[PDB]
Amino acid sequence: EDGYDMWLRYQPIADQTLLKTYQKQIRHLHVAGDSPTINAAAAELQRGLSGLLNKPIVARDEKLKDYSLVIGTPDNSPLIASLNLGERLQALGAEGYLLEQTRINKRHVVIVAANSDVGVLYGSFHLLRLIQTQHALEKLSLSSAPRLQHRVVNHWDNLNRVVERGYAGLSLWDWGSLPNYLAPRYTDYARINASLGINGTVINNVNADPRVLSDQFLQKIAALADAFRPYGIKMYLSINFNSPRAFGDVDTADPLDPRVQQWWKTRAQKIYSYIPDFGGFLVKADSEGQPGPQGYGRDHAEGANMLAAALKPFGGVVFWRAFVYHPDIEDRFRGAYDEFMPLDGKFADNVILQIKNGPIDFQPREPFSALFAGMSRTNMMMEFQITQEYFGFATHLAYQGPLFEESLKTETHARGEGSTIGNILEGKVFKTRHTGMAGVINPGTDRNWTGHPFVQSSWYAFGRMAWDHQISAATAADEWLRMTFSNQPAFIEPVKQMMLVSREAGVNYRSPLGLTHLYSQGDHYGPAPWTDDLPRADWTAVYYHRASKTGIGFNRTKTGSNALAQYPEPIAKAWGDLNSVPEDLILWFHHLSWDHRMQSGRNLWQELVHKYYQGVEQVRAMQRTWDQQEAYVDAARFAQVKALLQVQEREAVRWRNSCVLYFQSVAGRPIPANYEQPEHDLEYYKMLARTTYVPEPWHPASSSRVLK
Amino acid sequence: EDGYDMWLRYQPIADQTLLKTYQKQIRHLHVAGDSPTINAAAAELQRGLSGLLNKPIVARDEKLKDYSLVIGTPDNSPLIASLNLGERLQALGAEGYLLEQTRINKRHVVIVAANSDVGVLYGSFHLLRLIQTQHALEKLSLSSAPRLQHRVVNHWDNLNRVVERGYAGLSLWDWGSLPNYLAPRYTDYARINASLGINGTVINNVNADPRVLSDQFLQKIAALADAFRPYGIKMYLSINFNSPRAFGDVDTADPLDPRVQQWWKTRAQKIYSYIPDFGGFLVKADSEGQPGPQGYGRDHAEGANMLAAALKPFGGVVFWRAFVYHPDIEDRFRGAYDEFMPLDGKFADNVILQIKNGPIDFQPREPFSALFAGMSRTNMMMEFQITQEYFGFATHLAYQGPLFEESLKTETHARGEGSTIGNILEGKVFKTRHTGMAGVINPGTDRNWTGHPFVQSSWYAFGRMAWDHQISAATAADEWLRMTFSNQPAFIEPVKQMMLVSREAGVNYRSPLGLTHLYSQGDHYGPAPWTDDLPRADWTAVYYHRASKTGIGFNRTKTGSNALAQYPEPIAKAWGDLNSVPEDLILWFHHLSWDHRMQSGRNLWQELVHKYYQGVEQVRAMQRTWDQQEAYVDAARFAQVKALLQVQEREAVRWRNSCVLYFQSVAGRPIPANYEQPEHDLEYYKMLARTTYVPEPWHPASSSRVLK
C-alpha cells in the first residue's frame, strides 16, 4: 500500500459471507451507452467490481442477464427507460442519480439510473462506495443530488511546478511534456475527484502567472481539460488582473477602459477555442500585492463584471475572492465585510464571491465570515483549506472534517433560525442562483498525493461535504477509513475518534480560547507568538493577541473595533456578553484580565496553560491509539504514520513550550506545579524558531542558513 | 511498468526453455551468514530468484541440497571454505567475487563466493543480472573485481529539497520526517546503487549549505547512512568552506588559523560519533562565488590538507573539486590546469582531486581535461554528469554511455601509448593511492527516479563503467535494455543503436565541430548562441565560438591561448595540425575561415549547416525506430517515450533553426536549398528563447513571466 490509489482501493471484500452475497447479486455489468463519460463509468465499475468481488466482471451491451448491475439514463439505456421512473428521476436533476435493487422483465437487477451521463458516473462511484464500505445491497433504494452547483478544488501551483503551501510534492502538471504526454496520472486525478462528485478544478496559483493565458500554455492546459472532461470536471484558471499589460498589449488594466474590455473578450474567445466547456476564472485581486481594479481607482464590482462580460457568451463564471484586507484599517477582522458589503447587488449574475470560512486566514479556529450572513443579493461560495498550511504541513495528523462541519453547521441567524452557513451556501437563505464550495488541496507528485496519509481524509471529507453540506465529519471518516484501511469495527472506532480529535488537538497546542495567528512568519510551520516589527502590523502575532501584564485578547465589541456589529443581532449579542460568548472563541472579541475565571474554575492564565498542555496530551494519546492498530494496517503505512506522529509530538511540545513560555514572559505568572516545566527558557525556543528546518520546498525559510 | 524498479525488474523469464533450465539449476538458496550485508544479499536473491524463476525460493541455512545457489565467504560459510579456493579467490580483493558452477559434497551448486560480505552482495547482483539478461549458467566460471576504489554518485540537492540541475523531482531526502521515518525508498535507492557496485554517495549540493554539519541535520543524515550501510554505501557530504563562520564559532575560515583547524577537527569528531564509517567531504571551493581558501589568500592545497587532517584519524577522504576558473584569465579552457599543476605533490594522501571529464563544463563534447595527463603526484578521480543539464533535461532522450566511453578510452600519451583516461584513473599510469569516479545523477521523487526513462540507462552505464572502465556503451546498453524492457533480439538491436546514436544527435543539433557553450544562460534548456554581455565574458556564448564574417573557432594553438601546450606533446601535435586534428574537436583549437574545406568536401559553413540538420534527422529516425517497438514494450512506457521524443524533435528543430539562423546572420551565407528553410526568422527564435517554458523547478527561468 503506497497510497497512490487513495480511497479507491478495489481489493477483495475481507468478510467472506458478505463477499458471497455481493457475488450472487452482481454477476454481470450491463452498459448500453458509449459516450466518453458512460465509458469512464463502465471502466470504473469494471475495475472496481472485478477487484472487490474477486472475479472478472466485464461491461457488455447484451440481452439482459439475471443478477446484473445495469447503468444508464432513459436516453441511452432502453432497460432503464422501461422502468418508467418518471418523477423519481425528475427530482435528481442534472447531476443526481438513483441506486435501486429492482426487476426488469423478471430479471433481478441493481440499477444506477440518472438523467445525465455524469449522474450515472457519480452514481457508479456511490455504488462502489457501498461495497467498499460493506453496505448491504438487498432492498437498496436511494437517490442523491448534489446540494451545491460548483464543487471545485484549488491548486496553488506555480508554473515552475513548486506549489505554494504545498507539502505533497511538485505540481502534478508536467508542462515540459504537455500537451504531447497524456500521463495516466492526469486520469487518476480525475477519477479521485469525480469519485467525490467534484466537478471543477482551478489548477494554478491565485498569485497568478499571466503565462497561463498564452497560447503556449493554453495548448497544454487543453490537454489536461481533455483528460478531465469525461469525468465531468471543468477547467478553471486563476488570472492576473494586469494580464493586458503583462502581454504588452495594453498600457493599462483599468476595467473601464474599452481596450482592456476587448482584450479580455478576445482572450476568452481564445481560451474557448481550445476548451469549449471552460469553467471560468478564479481571481485574487488587490490583495497581498496582487494587482486589481483598486490599482486603477476602480472597485471590485467593476473589475469582476468586466471579466464576467468576457465570459458570459461562453457560459463562463468568475469566482472573485473576498480575501482582501488593506494594511491601514483598524482591524483586519473587519476587512472583507467592509470591502464587499457596499457592493452587494452590484455584481453580475455570473460572478460568485468566494469567501474563506473565517475573516482572517484559515486559522485553526475562526468565527464565520460575516459576509456569509450579510450579502443578500450576491452569489457566494465557500473556500476551505485542506493543505495543512496552519495544521502542520505534512508531518502533523489533522483531519479537517470537524473544521468543515463546524463551519457548515454554524447558525448565523441571518434570516431566522436555520440560517446555517450550509443553508446559506445552498442558496435557500438569500435565494441566489450559483452556489459552491472550493477546497485548497495542494497535492503533488508524492506517491500518495498528499504527503501525510491523513491529508487524504481531509480531501475526502471536503468533497463529500461539497456534495451534501450536512454530511458529518464522523460519517466521512467512517467511509474513508473503510475505503482506505480496513472494515474491522475494532479498528474503525478508535481511529475515527483519533481523527475526530486531531483538529482540536491542533487548536490546543497552537492557539486555543480564541487566540490566533501565532505562527512563524511567513512560512507558518512553527510557533512564533512574539512576532512583531513586520512591514505590516496585521502580519504579526502581537497584533492579534495583544497580551500584556494585565490581560490578553482583542476587543471587537462596541467598546473596541465593533466588528461584532458586522454580524446579525443575535450573534452580536451572544458573543458580546461574557456570560454567553463561547470560550472557544472568547479572545477573538474580548480583552480579558488574566484573573477572569473560566467555566472550568481556572483563571484565564491557568486555562491557557491547561489547553496548551492538553493539545500535547491529545497527540500522545493519538500515538498510543495508532500503536494499537498494528494488526489492521499494512506494515508500510503503519510505520509511516507511527513515525509522523513522533515528529508531530516533538513539534507539539515545541509549540506548547514556546507559547506557554512566551505568554509567561508577558503575564509574569508561574506555570502550575502539576505540569511538566520546560527545562529551557524562552530564548532557547526563539533560537529553535530560527533554526528548526521548515519542511516545504516553496517558502524561503526552508533555504534559511541561520544557525544561531 | 511505472519505472520504480528501474533495472531490477524480477519478472519471470519469458523464454520458456531458458526458464526451465534456470529452474532445474537453482532449486534452493543456501546462505550460512547473517550479517546485515549478507542478509541484504539473501533478501535480494530471494525476491530476485523467486520473481525471475516464477517459484518460491527462500534463503535457508540448512544441510546442502542438490541444485542450490550457495553464497558467502570462507569466513561465514563453511561450505564455501571447503572448496579451498585459495589464491584464486583471494586475488579478487575486498570487493570482488567468483560466480561458479561446481560441486560441494557431490551436490550440484553455483556459488557466489567472495572475501568480504559486500563482495557477496555485488556477486549476488551479478548472478541476478546473468539471469535477467538470459545468460547461461552451465559451466559458469567468472570472477570480477572493481577497477576503481571510490565509485560514487553525487546529488546536487538543496536542503529545501529542490535539486539544482534536477529534472526528476524533489530531493529523495525527506528532512521533515527524518530521522524518525525510515522510508522504504531509502533502501530501494541503496539497492539500485549496490546493484552497480556504487559504494558511496554525496547527498547534498556542492553549492553547499552549512546546516548539513549541524546536529539537527547530522541526526537525519545518520539515519540515511544507517539505511545505506548494509548495501556497502558510505555517506559523504559536500561542505561549505566558510562553515566555522556560518556557525558563528570563528571570525575567519583561513585554514592556517589554529581555531579553524580545531573547528574542523571537532566537527569531524561530531560527524564520526553519528556515522562511524563516514566517507568524507566533497568540496567546491573558490568557484562561482563559493567560499574557499583563496578568500583568505591561501591556496587549495592548504585548504584541502586542513580538511584532510581533520578526517585522517577517522579514515575519511577529501574529494577536492578541480572545477575552478577565475573570471580574469585569458582562456577558461586553461583554468583548472593552471590552478592545480603548481600544487601537484602538495596534497595530503587522503585528498583526491575530483576533475570533470573536460576543462569547460560537461558540454556535449569536450576534449579531455589536461589535468588527467599532467598531475603525476596527486590522487585523481573523474567526475561525469548523468543528469541532463546540457542534454535536454527530462524531455530529450540522450544515453550518456558513449560520452563516458569516449572519455575513458581516450589516449592521452601522458607516459606514452597506453595512457588512456581509464588507465590513468585506475592508477596504472602514475602510481597513486586513491582511485575513483563520481557521477552527478540528480534523481528525484518522480516515480521512475529520473524523469525521462532513458536517463536510467545513463546512471546504469556510469555504475558499470565505475566498476570496469573498459565496459563499452554498447554492452551496458545491451544489459540495461534486457533488464528494463525486453530480451527480444528484434527489439534489442534497433533500440541499442538508437541509444548509441542519441548522444551524437545531441551534439549535432546543439554545437557540432568543436562548438560549445551555446546554451540559454543560466538555465541551459534551449539555444542562445548570440549570448553576450554578461557580468563575466566566460559565461557567454560569443566568447567560445568567436564567429565573424570571416570565420569561427577559438585559437588554442601556439599562436592563440596555447592551451594545447598543457597537453602531452603527441596530443599538442595531433590537435595543433589541421591535417590531423579530429573534426569533431576542430573549433576548440582553431579559428578557421568559413571557406576551409572539411573531409566531406563541404566548406566549414556548409559542414556546420549539415551537422545541425543531421542532428534533427537523427531524432526523427529515433522516433521512427521507437514506433517500430510497440509490440515489445508495455503500453505506458511506450506512450511516454513516444511523446517525449515528439517534444525532443520539436526542441531539436528549435535548436537547429536558432543556431543556423544566428550563425548565418554573422557569416552572411545562404543555407543550401536541399535543407529545409527554417519556419521563421532569427528574431522569432530570439523571442522563442525568451518565452519557451524551461522545464526545471530549480532555475529561476522556469518562473520567468516574459511574454515577448
Ligand SMILES: O=C(O)[C@H]1O[C@@H](O)[C@H](O)[C@@H](O)[C@@H]1O
Ligand atoms: O489565500 C491566499 O491568497 C493566501 O492565503 C494565505 O493563507 C497564504 O499564506 C498565501 O500563500 C495565499 O496566497
Ligand SMILES: O=C(O)[C@H]1O[C@@H](O)[C@H](O)[C@@H](O)[C@@H]1O
Ligand atoms: O559543477 C558545478 O559546480 C556547477 O556546474 C555547472 O555545470 C552547473 O551549471 C552548476 O549548477 C553547478 O553547480
Ligand SMILES: [Co+2]
Ligand atoms: Co498513504
Ligand SMILES: [Co+2]
Ligand atoms: Co515558486
Ligand SMILES: [Co+2]
Ligand atoms: Co486518540
Ligand SMILES: [Co+2]
Ligand atoms: Co495565576
Ligand SMILES: [Co+2]
Ligand atoms: Co520509466
Ligand SMILES: [Co+2]
Ligand atoms: Co533552491
Ligand SMILES: [Co+2]
Ligand atoms: Co534510430
Ligand SMILES: [Co+2]
Ligand atoms: Co558558402
